[PDB]
Design a protein around this ligand. Sequence first.
Ligand SMILES: C[C@@H]1O[C@@H](O[C@H]2[C@H](Oc3cc(O)c4c(c3)O[C@H](c3ccc(O)cc3)CC4=O)O[C@H](CO)[C@@H](O)[C@@H]2O)[C@H](O)[C@H](O)[C@H]1O
Ligand SMILES: O=c1ccn([C@@H]2O[C@H](COP(=O)(O)OP(=O)(O)O)[C@@H](O)[C@H]2O)c(=O)[nH]1
Length: 419
Amino acid sequence: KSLKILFTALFGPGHLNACLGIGSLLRKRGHQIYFAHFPRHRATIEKHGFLFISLLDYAEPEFPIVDMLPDIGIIAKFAFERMHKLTPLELFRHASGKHTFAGMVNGSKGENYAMMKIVKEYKPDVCLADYLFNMPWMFTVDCPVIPVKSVNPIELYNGPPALTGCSIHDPPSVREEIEQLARKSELELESELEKLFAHFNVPLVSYNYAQQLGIYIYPGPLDYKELGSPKENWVRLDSNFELPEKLKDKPGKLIYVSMGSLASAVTELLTMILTPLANSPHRFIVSTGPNGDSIKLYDNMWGDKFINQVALLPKVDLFITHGGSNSLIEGLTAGKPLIAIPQFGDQLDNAQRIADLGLGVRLNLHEFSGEKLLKAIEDVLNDEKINANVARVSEELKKSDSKDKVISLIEKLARDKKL
Ligand SMILES: C[C@@H]1O[C@@H](O[C@H]2[C@H](Oc3cc(O)c4c(c3)O[C@H](c3ccc(O)cc3)CC4=O)O[C@H](CO)[C@@H](O)[C@@H]2O)[C@H](O)[C@H](O)[C@H]1O
Ligand SMILES: O=c1ccn([C@@H]2O[C@H](COP(=O)(O)OP(=O)(O)O)[C@@H](O)[C@H]2O)c(=O)[nH]1
């Protein structure tokens, strides 16, 4: 009856959360939880009572495990300079048939070898994995494997291409090109996946195929009901911060600013956003990121490298975000309107979904001005319809619950090896 359940995920701290939440639900039903990842996450995994397995302990000698987190600042700075210079359309034209994240595929060989060895050693009854793309080990190991998805799920539908930030309001003439480019770039992702799968002698699958079951986490009221149903076997899983003294005795609303764990490594991005907010008549709490001591703060601001974001969000009036999925769900669960300044990949889809459903505004780096940021703040704080829309979504998120259904499917698959 007690199952052995093994999780793993990509390097993003965001890619941990769905996995951690699903693991907590299964541990409460008496299952043994294992989580394979990097040492930096041992503390959170062991605090949850899951057994921590270090990917680094299982590397094949000639395929060292690529750890992308420490170098992310270099990659993130290149992405920032493209976003500040180019329109979304120009970004795709300049990409010239290269894909947003296919660059990561070749380097994934070491992690695949490690997971092969980990699943052979620990012999779990089922595995769950939150990746950007399927990996060969998911089709070679002796147990069922559930892909877990936390990125914007438009890629699970037959609609507008993923990673473009297409609007529901874009006419066919306006989008037909950016869409064609996105299609040529899907072929580069397939080509790189074909080389990774060939290396391991595994027949290639679609990058987001769910063989028996896939679990995606996205706000129900934001999901793409207008595109019909997600891909086969995918199911949606619906589940006191102390204010600094510096910001007391000061007028205006309280605003949280975060460009997320990864993009915040780019000090130039936060500096570009903060400078004009010195003149906004409100109070700002800032997640300053790992280089945060290099970031200048003004008299109306307080910040630290890593904020207790979930404790803070109920106390704020507005969330200035990069539009990452974890930040989107946390902000809307707390009932706070968003200004999304997207930085990379699925953040463009989330930013446009916020604008399209009246939950906030999208502000692009390529046409950014201080005047426009300050005006976005005043507009959203005073927009009774946006504040009503956000309140309605937060209520729906508090009520919606698919846990029993999804846990039953995981347990059924773990025991029967079929659904
Ligand atoms: C994995 C990387 O692959 C190449 O590089 C490409 C780069 O590859 C990635 C692959 C990824 O999986 C990610 C990435 C870049 O950056 C993402 C990112 C994260 C945070 C940000 O603020 C901005 C961007 C994170 C991610 O998952 O993609 C660019 C287009 O989006 C291309 O122009 C780059 O040739 C290049 O070989 C890099 O040296 C190598 O580290
Ligand atoms: O200063 C910070 C930055 C991030 N996070 C948490 O780290 C996770 C990932 O945040 P990020 O914005 O990087 O994720 P994304 O929105 O891109 O998915 C979430 O649970 C956030 O609440 C946090 O607590 N404090």
